[model samples]
Target: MGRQTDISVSLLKPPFEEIWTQQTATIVCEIVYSDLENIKVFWQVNGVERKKGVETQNPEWSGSKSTIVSKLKVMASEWDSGTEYVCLVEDSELPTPVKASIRKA
Candidate 1:
């Protein structure tokens, strides 16, 4: 029993692991799957999808697996305000999307 895809999202900026309201911030997403084709990744904040500010790296290949790294850039204000940030991964083999979520407390 295994998942068709795996995803993890982490706060990667502000080096100190702390952020100020006005500062810029980023969350990195690491995804692993058997095939990278036909898979989609996107970020959502406060239940809304973001159309821009996401950067993705070239897919890496391994034996029967592929890894894709992506980052979402946004203002620190969102985190400071307790907004929920989500990373949704759509996989062809999965009936529903899989995701990882983060929020500042």
Candidate 2:
């Protein structure tokens, strides 16, 4: 049997204290999984899949597993307009995609 590991998603804080219209900001989605060989990660904005301004890095080795950090760059205008950004994670072991989301308060 293949090794199976737990998966978790988190929303990373931006460098700025608060988001503002027309200002560029980044929302990071961090996915931690044990088996990196069979995982897929991506980003979505307002329920729409996005590729532009999205950056995904190679998996980094953790103490005993690995993690992938995907970043989505956006203008505060999107947030000001009430956009819902989400990070979706899929794995061979999971029955459904796991998601984490954030929006301007």
Candidate 3:
């Protein structure tokens, strides 16, 4: 497998584009791997790093495999519009970072 890869994000309950206005939202990302290994997940908002509430191997989320994930809660603000939220998955042994972005809701 390659060192860099992407994770999929979905708004758990509502359409992310619409609900991004009134309430906080969480994106659920799942990684499918038949093998066990170590990796790190990172998140950034508009290119700025979000260091809070980072999680890995979360039972409530990722199953038994090692995984890195983040749940970001944000209140809709003027600055958030037209901005990009980026999520990255990196294999610790690899030097490159895999990333994806979504426009602000």
Among the numbered candidates, top lDDT falls to 2
* lDDT at position 77, candidate 2: 72
- C-alpha TM-score for every candidate: 0.73, 0.79, 0.57
In order, candidate lDDTs are: 0.69, 0.76, 0.50
Which lDDT tens digits does candidate 3 get at residues 1-105? 883333443322213455345443554344443243465667676678765643444633345433344555554452256545666767655456666666543
Best by TM-score: 2
- Please list all clashing residue pairs in model 2, or write none if there are none: none
Q: Which tens-of-lDDT digit does each residue in 40-76 have in candidate 1?
A: 8877888788767888888878787777878877777
lDDT of 2 by residue, 28-73 (tens): 9988888445677778887788768888788888788688888887
Cα displacement (Å) at residue 102, model 2: 0.6
Clashing pairs in 3: none
RMSD of each: 3.2, 3.3, 4.9
| Root-mean-square deviation of Cα positions for candidate 3 versus the true structure, in angstroms | 4.9
The TM-score, computed over Cα atoms with residue i paired to residue i, of candidate 1 is: 0.73
